[PDB]
Amino acid sequence: DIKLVESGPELKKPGETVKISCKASGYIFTNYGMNWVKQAPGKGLKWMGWINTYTGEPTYSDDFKGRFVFSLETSVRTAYLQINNLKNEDLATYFCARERDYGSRYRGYALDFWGQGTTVTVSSATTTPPSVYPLAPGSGAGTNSMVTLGCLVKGYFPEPVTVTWNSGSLSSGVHTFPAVLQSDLYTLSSSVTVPSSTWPSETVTCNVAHPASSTKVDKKIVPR
Amino acid sequence: DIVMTQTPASLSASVGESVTITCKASGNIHNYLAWYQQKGGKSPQLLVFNASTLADGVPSRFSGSGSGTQYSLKINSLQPEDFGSYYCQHFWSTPFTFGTGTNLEIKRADAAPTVSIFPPSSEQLTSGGASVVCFLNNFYPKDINVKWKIDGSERQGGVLNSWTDQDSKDSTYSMSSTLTLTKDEYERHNSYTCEATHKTTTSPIVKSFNRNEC
Residue B46, domain CATH = 2.60.40.10
- DSSP states along A124-167: SPPPB--EEEEE---TTT--SSEEEEEEEEEEEBSS--EEEEGG
**Residue B123 DSSP class:** H
Task: Please check whether residues B101 and B141 belong to one and the same domain.
Answer: no
Q: Total domain count for chain B?
A: 2
Tell me, yes or no, whether B83 and B120 share the same domain. Answer: no
Q: In what order do the strands lie in the sheet with B159-163?
A: B114-118, B129-139, B173-182, B159-163
Nearest to residue B74, comparing CAs of B31, B22, B4?
A: B22
Beta bridge partners of B16: none
* B114 and B150 share one domain: yes
Q: From CA B17, how far away is CA B3, in angstroms rounded?
A: 30
Q: What DSSP element (H or E) covers B6? A: strand B4-7
| Cβ <8 Å between B135 and A191 | yes
Helix, strand, coil percentages in chain A from 3-state DSSP, rounded to 5 = 10, 50, 40
Q: Count CA atoms within 13 Å of residue A138 on its CB side.
A: 22
Decide whether A1-124 matches A125-222 in CATH topology.
yes
d(CA A173, CA A191): 8
Same domain assignment for residues B102 and B10: yes
Decide if A24 contacts A77 (C-beta within 8 A): yes
Would you say A128 and A157 are in contact if contact means Cβ atoms under 8 Å apart?
Answer: yes
Residues of B in contact with A24 (CB under 8 A): none
The verdict on B22 and B79 lying in the same domain is yes
Question: Residue B173, exposed/middle/buried by CB under 10 A (0-12, 13-18, 19+)?
Answer: buried
Ramachandran area for residue B44 (φ above 0: left; ψ -120 to 50: alpha; else beta): beta
Strand duo B114-118 + B129-139: pairing = antiparallel
Judge whether A134 and A189 are in contact, CB under 8 Å.
no
> Strand B191-197 vs strand B145-150: parallel, antiparallel, or unpaired?
antiparallel
- A196 shares contact with chain B (CB less than 8 Å): no
Q: Which residues of A touch B133 (CB under 8 A)?
A: 135, 150, 152, 189
CA B72 and chain centroid, separation: 24
Nearest to B13 by CA among B64, B56, B61: B61
Query: Is B118 in Cβ contact with A137 (below 8 Å)?
Result: yes
Residue ending a domain, choose from B108, B123, B147: B108
Q: Name the residue type at position B174.
A: S
Put simply, the answer to whether A110 touches B163 (Cβ < 8 Å) is: no
Taking the Cβ of residue A154 and every Cβ of chain B, the question of whether any pair is shorter than 8 Å is answered with: yes
User: C-alpha angle A34/A37/A43, rounded to 5°?
Assistant: 170
- Which of left, alpha, beta for B158 (phi over 0: left; psi -120 to 50: alpha)? left
Contact A177 B163 (CB under 8 A): yes
The strand order across the sheet containing A146-156 reads A131-135, A146-156, A185-195, A174-182
What is the number of other CB atoms lying within 10 angstroms of the CB of residue A95? 24
Question: Does residue B135 sit in the same domain as residue B60?
Answer: no
Q: What is the DSSP string of B135-163?
A: EEEEEBSS--EEEEEETTEEE-SSEEEEE
Burial pattern B42-77, b for ≥16 Cβ within 10 A else e, equals ebbbbbbbbbbeebeebeeebbbebeebebbbbbee
Q: Distance (Å, rounded) from C-alpha A189 to C-alpha B162?
A: 9
Name the residue among B96, B5, B142 with its Cα closest to residue A99.
B96
Do B156 and B186 lie in one domain? The reply is yes
Contacts of A56 (CB under 8 A, 6+ apart): A71, A72
Q: Which of A121, A124, A139 is nearest to B117 (CA)?
A: A139
- Picking from B55, B91, B174, the nearest residue to A108 by CB comes out as B91
Contact between B3 and B26 under an 8 Å Cβ cutoff? The reply is: yes
Q: For residue B64, what is the enclosing H or E element?
A: strand B62-67
Q: Is the N-terminal amide bond of B95 cis, ω within 30° of 0?
A: yes
- The alpha-carbon radius of gyration of chain A (Å, integer) is 22
Domain ranges for chain A: 1-124, 125-222
Q: Does B186 lie in the same domain as B114?
A: yes
Q: For residue A176, give the 3-state DSSP assignment.
A: strand
Do residues B139 and B112 lie in contact, with contact meaning Cβ atoms separated by under 8 Å?
Answer: yes
- Closest by alpha carbon to A224, among A154, A134, A148, A147? A134
Q: What is the DSSP letter of A112?
A: E
| A33 in reach of chain B (CB within 8 A) | no
Report yes or no: A6 and A21 within 8 Å, Cβ to Cβ. yes
- Do B45 and B101 fall within a single domain? yes
Can you say whether residue B100 is alpha, beta or left, with left for phi > 0 and alpha for psi between -120 and 50 degrees? alpha
List the strands of the sheet with B153-155, edge to edge: B153-155, B145-150, B191-197, B205-210
Q: How far is CA B85 from CA A119, B10, B109, B147, B164, in A?
A: 19, 9, 21, 31, 15
Resolution in A: 2.0
Give the largest Cα separation in chain A, rounded. 71
Q: What is the CATH number of domain A125-222?
A: 2.60.40.10
Q: Is A166 left (phi over 0), alpha (psi -120 to 50) or beta?
A: left
Q: Is A13 helix (H, G, I), strand (E, B) or coil?
A: coil
DSSP H or E segment with residue B124: helix B122-125
Q: Residue A206 CA to chain centroid, in angstroms?
A: 20
Residues B101 and B117 in one domain: no
Number of helical H runs and strand E runs in chain A: 0, 18
Choose among B43, B49, B124: nearest Cβ to A133. B124
Q: What CA–CA distance (Å, rounded) separates A98 from B45? A: 12
Query: CATH topology for A1-124?
Result: Immunoglobulin-like (2.60.40)
Last residue of a domain, one of B67, B92, B108: B108
Cβ-based neighbours of A175, under 8 Å, separated by 6 or more: A190, A191, A192, B135, B137, B164, B174, B176
Neighbouring C-alpha atoms within 13 Å toward the C-beta of B149: 15
Q: Does A138 contact B117 at a Cβ distance shorter than 8 Å?
A: yes
Size of interface A-B (CB pairs under 8 A): 158
CB contact under 8 A, B176 and A111: no
H or E stretch covering B129: strand B129-139
| Chain B residues in contact with A59 (beta carbon < 8 A) | 94
> Minimal CA–CA distance to B85: which of B6, B144, B174?
B6
Round to whole Å and give the CA distance between B87 and B100. 7
- The end-to-end CA distance of chain A, in Å, is 51
Is A47 within 8 Å of B38 when comparing Cβ atoms? no
Residue A34: enclosing H or E segment and its boundaries? strand A34-39
Closest to A102 measured CA to CA, from A33, A150, A154: A33
Residue B191 to residue B193: CA distance in whole angstroms: 6
Give DSSP secondary structure letters for B154-187.
Answer: EE-SSEEEEE----TTT--EEEEEEEEEEHHHHH
Q: Which of B83, B108, B133 is the last residue of a domain?
A: B108
Structural domain of residue B162, as residue ranges?
Answer: 109-211
B141 cis-preceded (ω within 30 degrees of 0): yes
Q: Are B200 and B139 in contact (CB under 8 A)?
A: yes
Residues B94 and B148 in one domain: no
> What 3 state SS string does B86-112 have?
EEEEECCCCCCCECCCEEEEEECCCEC
Q: Are residues B85 and B138 in the same domain?
A: no
CA–CA separation, B30 and A42 (whole Å):
31
Of the residues A34, A43, A152, A163, the best mutation for testing chain B's interface (the one with the most B CB atoms within 10 Å of its CB) is A152
Say if A110 is an interface residue toward chain B (CB within 8 Å): yes
CA distance A106 to chain B (A): 6
Which residue type sits at B176?
S
- CA distances from residue A35 to A58, A94, A125 in whole angstroms, order as listed: 10, 10, 31
Residues 50-89 of B with CB under 8 A from A: 50, 55, 85, 87, 89
